[PDB]
Amino acid sequence: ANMKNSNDRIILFRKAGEKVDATKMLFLTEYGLSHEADTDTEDTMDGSYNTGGSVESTMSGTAKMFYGDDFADEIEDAVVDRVLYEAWEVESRIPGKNGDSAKFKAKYFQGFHNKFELKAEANGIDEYEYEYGVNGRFQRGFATLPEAVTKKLKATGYRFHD
């Protein structure tokens, strides 16, 4: 019991340094966040030992493109123009305890988008996939979800709604 569905993660972005509310990444199909340490090991006849190299960290994902949108166009601008982007990963169902009562547990990253591929195939809605390279230590915290996007602008049909 209490298993954690993937679709309860909310991924948010904004262009770094401009004072605007973060924009939600709609229609994610799959997602992943990776951390990996580039450790070497040094041998000696006294015995081998393992040396603590640096860590590379990256976020990756796929989404379906749609007509009421302009964000994939921003991703493909960002990868070419090397624009710095802030990003959040927010857990839509872990609320903050007190004072942060209206906020949800999150990771904050900033970094650069490093990949964007459109995939289009006959008899199919075209996907795009992207990769984002995190700078430094990601920072833990609590994040405010943009309530107007997440709960006010509900829509009927197969779009998820309460």
């Binding site: 948010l12 904004r14 770094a16 340094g17 401009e18 004072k19 605007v20 509310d21 973060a22 802030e86 959040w88 927010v90 906020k103 904050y108 900033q110 700078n135 430094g136 920072q139 833990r140 915290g141 994040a143 405010t144 979800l145 943009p146």
Partner: peptide, 12 residues
């Protein structure tokens, strides 16, 4: 960098 909230009131 430190943590910054999603909203424009906490712009970078």
């Amino acid at each position: 960098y430190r943590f910054h909230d999603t909203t424009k009131e906490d712009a970078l």
